[PDB]
């Protein structure tokens, strides 16, 4: 399974920093995150400037990068999928797990384009995505927590189902809100965790590390040449 | 590793004692432990003499020997790591699990230098270390016990994560305070336990062994002419 | 582990009896057991008589026979172990799991002599024995029961540890006191159970066998002419 | 295990019925069952009669058939065993799990004759049988139930012991009294279940099958030409 | 629950035997069991003879005796139930757990007649019976076993349900086939176990009792003057 | 807990039928169910006609009857709740579990009107309902199943929460779809199960009941003169 | 346990909103929360203004309100605690769980002032607080999550400890970050959950509630004239 | 249960020893044990001498003393039981758990004599004993071990059965062979453990007690003036 | 059991420090600890000096103080116990759990002196102590850890036994080495934990407490006038 860590951000600022750590395997974007990257940096959404960014993200991380269709119906989804894919061989197409998503997923995957089926909220949805040839399924933990259900239980059922059925699809833990989402994904046997910059940064921090390092360096000072 | 046992020391006397038992697989050092050794002997603690002592340990134990960097930031950590590694093929470079640690881990490991990421107090930190190319992760059980959390639970999460995810990284149980730390580490499926000589020397102590041995010899002599 | 059944005795008459059943794989002796056999026959325990007795046991069982050293210091233990091994190819050398015992284990095993590390009362003792190159470890269930602790738990911990760590050493359940010691050992996945003659004799006995057989033979006599 | 179903009967009529279903793998007899079949059809029990009946059973089933010695001691058991084995290559020799039975088991198995050790009421008995070279062991579930102990637990211990120890011996669930004996055997991973005809007949019967079949046919009729 | 033992029979001879043991709390009959008793005696089943037989049973067991209606419609069930109840104060009226049975149960119970709701094969049936004012519910373990489902799990669900809900209804474990049904009932916390004479007669029969008794008396006799 | 059975319907005919069984404790209606009842009998839904229908239900069941407000803001909900409560003492006011619903719950409950907080899909919603003075909470099992989550798990959390916290609120298992919803509710310790007529009519239908009844009567007849 | 919901805020507007729902049992402040309120108002944080603000909160919520001392040594803590307690009877004094905090807790509690011992991150801290006379202990779930440990496990240990030992102290689940913290606390048997306004506002939100409500009202309208 | 400790012996010497410890609650004898004591002392086993011996045991232990009948038939058992009971008020009458034993139990218990039903090897036997008015039941752990079944499981079933059914009968763990039988009985919630003197004497022995006492006294004497 | 915290020391200065926290319920001494205190002060361990020191401890702590006898046989143990008891009402007499200790325990406890039975390393020892009238039993967790057994398991068995058997004796967790011993004791339901000063001082330490306090005070200062 060897679990990989992804950054769930369009911000290329955030991505460069984590890349340097040597722990970054990929990036996921979605329309919303695509959006606030372009609002915040203050530039406008040329289809050629959206391909420039995606291509720069791919370049930065040197691993899979997810980009989501906005098209409504299968035909337009497939069209948009092929264009996204063409931007860079790293690009993975995110489709919504709907009726139309499935049909597009089927067609895109048969042409050897890798599909990440997203907005998944039940094991049954993930099952259908797998059957339609998804390479990835992306359950949303945090949004389930948000409605007072256990997002961890969603992830568990999906991971367990994939394990038991030995389905080739990979499971991305998405909608990550806190470090323990990542640990639970790791322990369950998810394939990828994708998370915001702020969570990624948190993962590394522990008071005992701070205290331990401070003391160690003091000890060295006491004795050193 | 099949529950290999290490000493946490720079005492060659201690190393040679346990080595003769046939149970010593490696040594973990730190500048303070080495300083302690040098004060005992009275030798001045120069860079080259420090290196020579590490080399001496390597030749004695005939397995991995961890040496800890004191450099503050990544560039200098990598420089120091290369020097340490050049002392002897058996040398493993210990880095602190920080941002700078991760950077250096990535670079050292990419050059085929084995890295032991230390001061780990969460499974998440172990995960980051694994992603950055660590050969070893060293959680500290006793220091966690010290703040009234279960050090064994830290170890359990790390071991389970690495098992489920089939990560190649090996787990060193460190901050070992008592014999049952060793047993728990063994049962959980830690790869290595490293411990002070004092703890190593306690492992064999069970009253029933000496009581049994005494009675054996008594019975034996009774029937001899 | 294909569990084998051993006798824990030095009585030739006992060994002959069970050997004839076709289920006897081996014998363990210890100084007390050997002294008992010599006292019983009113024979002085001499070097020559001891050697003859061991050969007689070896020839009777046609499988491994454990003989314990009486020396307490590693150098003497190794010399004695070599002598013991040379008496008959079937001989396994028993050492006590002490500091000196480990040292001797390392050397004898390093030579290819099979070593049974005995007087084991903790998993940690078994671990160190395994690390030092033991072929067998022999936890004492009964003597642990004797001090109001669960001997079966000692065995469970040792088997579990050896299973999780995939240590090649074989586990002998020793100090067996009742038939359920044997069943527990078998269910846990111990490699050998070595037991007194009286317990061995019990294994075969269940009232329903006696009753069933009798009825079968009665029903046969009824209708056969 | 690919569990197989046997008939535990000497009744020839019983056997050809179930054989026709295509699910009958084998037959077990015992002195009582044989005697009851001969007193039924009024027929006298000679060596020639017995052999013909056994040969008839073998022909019908086209798989293993167990026949039990009546001889008291191992020499006579071996002699009788050879005779039985000579009646048909399908014939498996049943011995009682006794001291004499173990001896005859060892010898018969050594000569390539398959031995079913029976009248087993403990895991330890089954273990002894395994060590003596048994091809099958036959625990009696029902007769254990009869004395207010859980026959299922006997089966569980034996199956688990043989799984854990990876012993080649096959486990026959015998003394089967009701359908759930069969299900438990199957779930536990027993190799064979041998049962009286009446229980075999029961296995198929569930009211919902009959009700469902009736409704299908009635709905089909309703719309036929 | 202080579990009580009942006989499930209409044989007066059987009831007499067990009554003398001092352990018989009650009797359940049903139409089949009554038919069998009359057919065995070669007596015609009339209203008067039935009443006479019930009186005989009541006076023998001196506890509750269940007698079942044969009417299918509620109004007839009530009339029949009243006739039964009036035979002897210890008569409990058995109704089938059907729509009509519930109606009759409500009316009879409201009048102070104790109702045993029978032919129960699901927890839901037991629950409806309880709501309708049943004094007893009678799940059939054996008949569930007969169709390859776990009768014990039926009993477990019913007992657990009634414990959790603290319903005043008493649970009779019925359709008992073997001693372990009785033990299961006792351990679960059923109120009553009603069983055939043959099963009742098995309960005492453990071989170690008679073996122990024999030895006691042998040892006693050796030392008497 | 003494679980009670309710009908989830506004059909007078359905209610009259089950009431006659003697097992009907109450009724829940909702706007959809009432609308369906009025459409089916062709009447227009007025304030007066609604009141008359609710009275009819109250008089038929002789237990609690839930009627739902339709106002969306608290003041109007309270006014409507009072109007409903005034129809018959047995009326329980259903409110939707929303911000406004909590407000209305608080006021109505303070006035001594029993409130059933409905449209509950999380334990957190039920908790808020309880804090606001709810007499009942009604989780919807079936609608959760509908979105591929385990409705039973919602019920479990709510029941466990209320048990652990010893909150006086009663739990109604609602949106019931099949018999096993009822059993699960019973086993968990829910206070009420409210179910469609179709499910209620299923509860009794186990094939072994009628099969057994038929055989009883056959045996009975054979022995009659 | 009868779990109560508190707001963890000093914002009067937030408190007024939730109070009106009828579900608000109390308020916790801390120095940070109060500072933030005073910053955003633009008001000067004086002794008089602090007191008036706390008094306002007390009047709004009509239940316990926690206010934290800022003195660092016990004598001053006690002086400060008395001043706080004098503001309004509902004031609970928050002390940090330190050496000095224990001292102040002992004295304040002996005087009949309710003490909330806060900044608790271990069960051992909670235990000492209880022994020192705390009325409440406040483990911080979220801050533990922040360092990649399970904050829920902290809460579990504290709750289980206080249950097992029957300590009269009440457990406040604090540092709450998401709805499932609240559910977890409720299920474990915590006494109070105190949470930010934002989380409080989330608790009610489940999509099936509004979907169900909308359909209810659609169906309702259709049958009205 | 407040478990009490008994001696299972007829040796007055043994009883005197343990009585003096202050931990002896009672004694069980059986025919074998009494015979053994009489043979050892060279005394004829007459009625008068048996009575004098039992009276002496009663006076020594100052608690219940079990004396077993030799009669096999109920009428003789009752006569014998009365004679035993008349020896001393502390006498408890032991009967074998057979059909006749039940009858005698019923009568003797009805007369106010305390009956210990013995030779129990199944829960069902214990259940019948309870129904027949037994004050005590005595399962035999060791003799079950002897036939390769788990005697502890027998004890578990009996204790759990009596707990669940809240039967007033007390459970004596008998046929005790080792210290862990005693611990098992204590943990399970047996009322009494009765054991041979040899086992009683083992209970206190633990090497760490001896070692700790010796150190204490050494440290003490070092500093005495 | 409302677990209490004790100091395991003879140091008045240590005792004074913790007393002032308001969390100290009592003190245990043993001969070693008293020896050590006296040698540290360089003071002569006389009878008057020991009494004075103990009385001082009693006055400081204002709860139970354990003082151990050094006499080896029961009569002298009782004499010494009475002398200890007469020092101050709070004095509890510690006896070693030996044969002589049991005898002295019985007598002292009968006289109304509270006895703490110590050097306990098995549940069976604790059981004997309980039967002999002990008010406290003191298992030694650390010394068991020292021999590579699980000290926690000793405590678990003793607590569970006392719970199940509802014995009035209180359990002191002694030989405590680290904070998690205290937590384990608390969670299990031990009555008392007695620990060295160093461990007591650790209990409060958690880094997040001080980090949180520091931040609180910063934020506060920002806004103050």
Q: Encode chain B in three state secondary structure.
A: CCCEEEEECCCHHHHHHHHHHCCEEEEECCHHHHHHHHHHHCCCCCHHHHHHHHHHHHHHHCCCEEEECCCCCHHHHHHHHHHHHHHCCCEEEEEECCHHHHHHHHHHHHCCCCEEEEEECCHHHHHHHHHCCCCEEEEEHHHHHCCCCCHHHHHHHHHHHHHHHCCCCEEEEECCCCHHHHHHHHHHCCCEEEECHHHHCCCCCCHHHHHHHHHHHHHHHHHCC
Q: Residues of H with CB below 8 A from E186's CB? A: 123-124, 127, 161, 164-165
Q: What are the residues facing E4 on neighbouring strands?
A: E192
Number of neighbouring beta carbons within 10 Å of residue B168: 10
Nearest CA-CA partner of E195 in E151, E140, E121: E140
Q: C-alpha distances in angstroms, H121 versus A224, H69, I46?
A: 74, 19, 60
> Does chain C touch chain B (at least 3 C-beta pairs within 8 Å)?
yes
C-interface mutation test, from H122, H142, H148, most C Cβ less than 10 A away: H148
Residue B181 contacts I, CB cutoff 8 Å: no
Task: Decide if B176 contacts B142 (C-beta within 8 A).
Answer: yes
Nearest CA-CA partner of D86 in D135, D42, D47, D43: D47
Residue F168 contacts A, CB cutoff 8 Å: no
Task: Decide if A118 contacts A95 (C-beta within 8 A).
Answer: yes
Q: C-alpha distances in angstroms, H101 versus E99, E211, F86, H66, H141?
A: 47, 15, 69, 15, 21
Q: C-alpha distances in angstroms, E6 versus E26, E191, E195, G222?
A: 5, 11, 6, 61
Element (DSSP H or E) covering residue G27: strand G26-28
Q: C-alpha distances in angstroms, I74 versus G91, I96, I106, I109, I150?
A: 58, 11, 10, 13, 32
Q: How far is CA D112 from the centre of its chain?
A: 20
Catalytic residues of C: 94
Number of neighbouring beta carbons within 10 Å of residue F155: 26
The Cα D178–Cα E179 span in angstroms is: 13
The Cα E14–Cα D224 span in angstroms is: 57
Task: Decide if E105 contacts E85 (C-beta within 8 A).
Answer: no
Nearest CA-CA partner of B135 in B176, B177, B90: B90
Contact across the interface for C103 and B21, Cβ inside 8 Å: yes
Element (DSSP H or E) covering residue A153: helix A151-165
Task: Decide if C50 contacts C83 (C-beta within 8 A).
Answer: no
Nearest CA-CA partner of E49 in A48, G211, C213, F224: F224
Q: Which long-range contacts (CB under 8 A, 24 or more apart) does E131-134 make?
A: E131/F4, E131/F5, E131/F22, E131/F23, E131/F25, E132/E102, E132/E103, E132/E105, E132/E106, E132/F21, E132/F22, E132/F23, E133/E105, E133/E106, E133/E108, E133/E109, E133/F22, E134/E105, E134/E109, E134/E169
Paired tokens of B41 = 């002997």
Q: Residues of I with CB below 8 A from A207's CB? A: 207-208, 211
The burial of C210, by beta-carbon neighbours within 10 Å (0-12 exposed, 13-18 middle, 19 or more buried), is given as middle
Task: Decide if H148 contacts C180 (C-beta within 8 A).
Answer: yes
Q: At what angle do helices C99-110 and C123-132 cross, to 10 degrees?
A: 30
Q: How far is CA I55 from the centre of its chain?
A: 17
Nearest CA-CA partner of G134 in G163, G93, G174, G175: G93
Q: C-alpha distances in angstroms, E185 versus E3, E161, E194?
A: 9, 14, 10
Task: Decide if H178 contacts I152 (C-beta within 8 A).
Answer: no
Nearest CA-CA partner of H30 in H187, H198, H215, H194: H194
Task: Decide if E197 contacts H129 (C-beta within 8 A).
Answer: no
The Cα G210–Cα G216 span in angstroms is: 10
Task: Decide if B148 contacts I180 (C-beta within 8 A).
Answer: yes
Task: Decide if A144 contacts A151 (C-beta within 8 A).
Answer: yes
> Which letter does DSSP use for residue H135 in this model?
S
Task: Decide if B18 contacts B7 (C-beta within 8 A).
Answer: yes
> Does chain I touch chain E (at least 3 C-beta pairs within 8 Å)?
no
Number of neighbouring beta carbons within 10 Å of residue I63: 15
Paired tokens of F22 = 């003697």
> Which letter does DSSP use for residue F134 in this model?
-
Q: What are the residues facing B8 on neighbouring strands?
A: B28
Q: How far is CA I124 from the centre of its chain?
A: 20
Q: Which chains touch F (3 or more CB pairs under 8 A)?
A: A, D, E, G
Strand pairing category for D170-173 and D4-8:
unpaired
Positive or negative: CA dihedral A78, A84, A86, A90: negative
Burial D175-214 (b: 16+ CB within 10 A, else e): bbbbbbbbbbbeebebbbbbbbbebbebbeebeeeeeeee
Q: Residues of D with CB below 8 A from H125's CB? A: 148
**Close Cβ partners of G168 (under 8 Å, ≥ 6 residues apart):** none
The catalytic position among G36, G41, G94, G222 is: G94
Nearest CA-CA partner of F166 in B105, G2, C60, H203: G2
Question: Whose structure tokens read 């990036």?
Answer: A27
Residue H25 contacts D, CB cutoff 8 Å: no
The catalytic position among F94, F103, F201, F214 is: F94
Paired tokens of D151 = 């026959």
**Count of all residues that appear for chain E in the document:** 225
Q: Residues of D with CB below 8 A from H124's CB? A: 148
What method did the depositors use to determine the structure? X-ray
I-interface mutation test, from A206, A207, A211, A214, most I Cβ less than 10 A away: A207
Task: Decide if I49 contacts I25 (C-beta within 8 A).
Answer: no
A122, A148, A153 ranked by CB distance to F148: nearest: A122
> Does chain A touch chain D (at least 3 C-beta pairs within 8 Å)?
no
Element (DSSP H or E) covering residue D194: strand D192-195
Chain I nearest-CA residue for G39 = I223
Chain I nearest-CA residue for C147 = I122
Q: How far is CA E154 from the centre of its chain?
A: 16
Contact across the interface for F149 and A125, Cβ inside 8 Å: no
I148, I149, I183 ranked by CB distance to B148: nearest: I183
Nearest CA-CA partner of E108 in E83, E73, E82: E82
Element (DSSP H or E) covering residue F119: strand F115-120
> Which letter does DSSP use for residue D175 in this model?
S
Nearest CA-CA partner of G212 in H15, F70, H163, D93: F70
Write out the DSSP string of chain E.
---EEEEE---HHHHHHHHTTT---EEE--HHHHHHHHHHHT----HHHHHHHHHHHHHHH-S-EEEE----SHHHHHHHHHHHHTT-TTEEEEEESSHHHHHHHHHHHHTT--EEEEEE-SHHHHHHHHHTT-SEEEEBHHHHHTTTS-HHHHHHHHHHHHHHTT--PEEEEBS--SHHHHHHHHHHT-SEEEE-HHHHHHTT--HHHHHHHHHHHHHHHHH--
Task: Decide if A196 contacts A141 (C-beta within 8 A).
Answer: no
Q: Residues of B with CB below 8 A from C140's CB? A: 208, 212
The Cα D111–Cα F78 span in angstroms is: 92
Please say if H103 is a catalytic residue. no
The burial of A103, by beta-carbon neighbours within 10 Å (0-12 exposed, 13-18 middle, 19 or more buried), is given as middle
Q: What are the residues facing F48 on neighbouring strands?
A: none
Task: Decide if I64 contacts I87 (C-beta within 8 A).
Answer: no
The catalytic position among D94, D103, D214, D222 is: D94
E-interface mutation test, from D5, D142, D177, D178, most E Cβ less than 10 A away: D178
Nearest CA-CA partner of H84 in H51, H41, H52: H51
> Which letter does DSSP use for residue H148 in this model?
T
The Cα E98–Cα E125 span in angstroms is: 8
- Angle (CA) F101-F105-F107 rounded to 5° is 120
Contact across the interface for H208 and B207, Cβ inside 8 Å: yes
The catalytic position among H94, H201, H205, H222 is: H94
Give the gap in angstroms from C-alpha A204 to the nearest C-alpha of chain B: 5
Q: Which chains touch C (3 or more CB pairs under 8 A)?
A: B, D, E, H, I
Q: At what angle do helices F31-41 and G207-223 cross, to 10 degrees?
A: 20
Paired tokens of G129 = 């607080």
The burial of H163, by beta-carbon neighbours within 10 Å (0-12 exposed, 13-18 middle, 19 or more buried), is given as middle
Strands (E), chain C: 4-8, 24-28, 65-68, 91-96, 115-120, 136-139, 170-173, 192-195
D31, D96, D131 ranked by CB distance to C219: nearest: D31
I-interface mutation test, from C128, C148, C155, most I Cβ less than 10 A away: C148
Chain G nearest-CA residue for F139 = G209
Residue A205 contacts I, CB cutoff 8 Å: no
CA atoms within 13 A on the CB side of A212: 22
A149, A178, A207 ranked by CB distance to G145: nearest: A178
Task: Decide if E180 contacts D148 (C-beta within 8 A).
Answer: yes
- Taking only residues 34 to 93 of chain E, the set having a beta carbon closer than 8 angstroms to any beta carbon of chain F reads 34-36, 38-39, 44-46, 68, 70, 72
| Total CB pairs under 8 A between chain A and I | 5
Paired tokens of H162 = 């009596």
Contact across the interface for G220 and F97, Cβ inside 8 Å: no
Chain B nearest-CA residue for C48 = B224
D121, D123, D148 ranked by CB distance to H122: nearest: D148
E2, E183, E212 ranked by CB distance to H166: nearest: E2
Paired tokens of H20 = 């003096």
Give the gap in angstroms from C-alpha H146 to the nearest C-alpha of chain E: 11
Q: Residues of I with CB below 8 A from B207's CB? A: 147
Paired tokens of H83 = 């004679």
The Cα C60–Cα E28 span in angstroms is: 64
Task: Decide if B209 contacts C98 (C-beta within 8 A).
Answer: yes
SS3 F160: helix
Paired tokens of C56 = 């007689």
Question: Whose structure tokens read 């009047």?
Answer: G59
SS3 C110: helix
Q: What are phi and psi of B139, to 5 degrees?
A: -70, 150
Task: Decide if E174 contacts E191 (C-beta within 8 A).
Answer: no
The Cα G94–Cα I111 span in angstroms is: 47
Task: Decide if E94 contacts E84 (C-beta within 8 A).
Answer: no
The burial of C128, by beta-carbon neighbours within 10 Å (0-12 exposed, 13-18 middle, 19 or more buried), is given as buried
Give the gap in angstroms from C-alpha A217 to the nearest C-alpha of chain I: 19
The catalytic position among A36, A41, A94, A170 is: A94
Paired tokens of B54 = 């590490």
What ranges in chain H are assigned the alpha helix state H? 12-19, 31-41, 47-61, 74-85, 99-110, 123-131, 141-146, 151-165, 179-188, 197-202, 207-223
Q: What are phi and psi of F44, to 5 degrees?
A: -85, 145
Residue G149 contacts B, CB cutoff 8 Å: yes
Paired tokens of G84 = 């706080």
Q: C-alpha distances in angstroms, F172 versus F159, F182, H55?
A: 10, 11, 66
> Which letter does DSSP use for residue G218 in this model?
H
Contact across the interface for H183 and C207, Cβ inside 8 Å: no
Task: Decide if E96 contacts E30 (C-beta within 8 A).
Answer: no
H3, H21, H213 ranked by CB distance to I99: nearest: H21
> Does chain G touch chain I (at least 3 C-beta pairs within 8 Å)?
yes
| Total CB pairs under 8 A between chain C and D | 121
Task: Decide if B46 contacts B25 (C-beta within 8 A).
Answer: no
> Does chain G touch chain A (at least 3 C-beta pairs within 8 Å)?
yes
**Count of all residues that appear for chain G in the document:** 225
The Cα G183–Cα G203 span in angstroms is: 10
The Cα F106–Cα C92 span in angstroms is: 82
**Close Cβ partners of E95 (under 8 Å, ≥ 6 residues apart):** E68, E69, E77, E81, E101, E104, E105, E108, E115, E116, E117, E118
Positive or negative: CA dihedral G9, G13, G14, G18: positive
Q: Which chains touch H (3 or more CB pairs under 8 A)?
A: B, C, D, E, I
The Cα H92–Cα H83 span in angstroms is: 11
Task: Decide if H209 contacts C174 (C-beta within 8 A).
Answer: no
Q: C-alpha distances in angstroms, A12 versus A15, B100, B202, E192, H6?
A: 5, 21, 55, 74, 79
Residue H213 contacts B, CB cutoff 8 Å: no
């Amino acid at each position: 399974s060897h679990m990989e860590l992804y950054l769930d951000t369009a911000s290329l600022e955030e991505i460069r920093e984590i890349a340097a750590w040597g722990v970054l395997s990929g990036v996921t974007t979605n329309p919303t995150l695509v959006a606030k990257a372009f609002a915040a940096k203050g530039e406008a959404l040329t289809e050629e400037a959206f391909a420039a960014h995606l291509r720069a993200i791919c370049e930065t991380v040197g691993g899979p990068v997810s980009a989501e269709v906005t098209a409504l119906e299968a035909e337009a989804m497939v069209a948009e999928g092929r264009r996204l894919a063409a931007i860079h061989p790293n690009i993975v197409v995110k489709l919504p797990t709907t009726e139309e998503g499935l049909k597009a997923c089927k067609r895109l995957s048969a042409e050897g384009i890798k599909v990440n089926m997203t907005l998944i909220f039940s094991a049954n949805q993930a099952l259908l995505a797998a059957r339609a040839g998804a390479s990835y399924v992306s359950p949303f933990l945090g949004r389930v927590d948000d409605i007072s259900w256990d997002g961890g239980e969603l992830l568990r059922e999906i991971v367990e189902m994939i394990q038991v059925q030995d389905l080739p699809v990979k499971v991305i833990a998405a909608s990550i809100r806190h470090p323990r989402h990542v640990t639970e994904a790791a322990l369950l046997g998810a394939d990828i965790a994708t998370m915001p910059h702020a969570v990624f940064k948190q993962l590394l921090k522990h008071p005992l590390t701070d205290i331990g390092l401070k003391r160690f360096l003091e000890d060295w000072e006491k004795v050193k040449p």
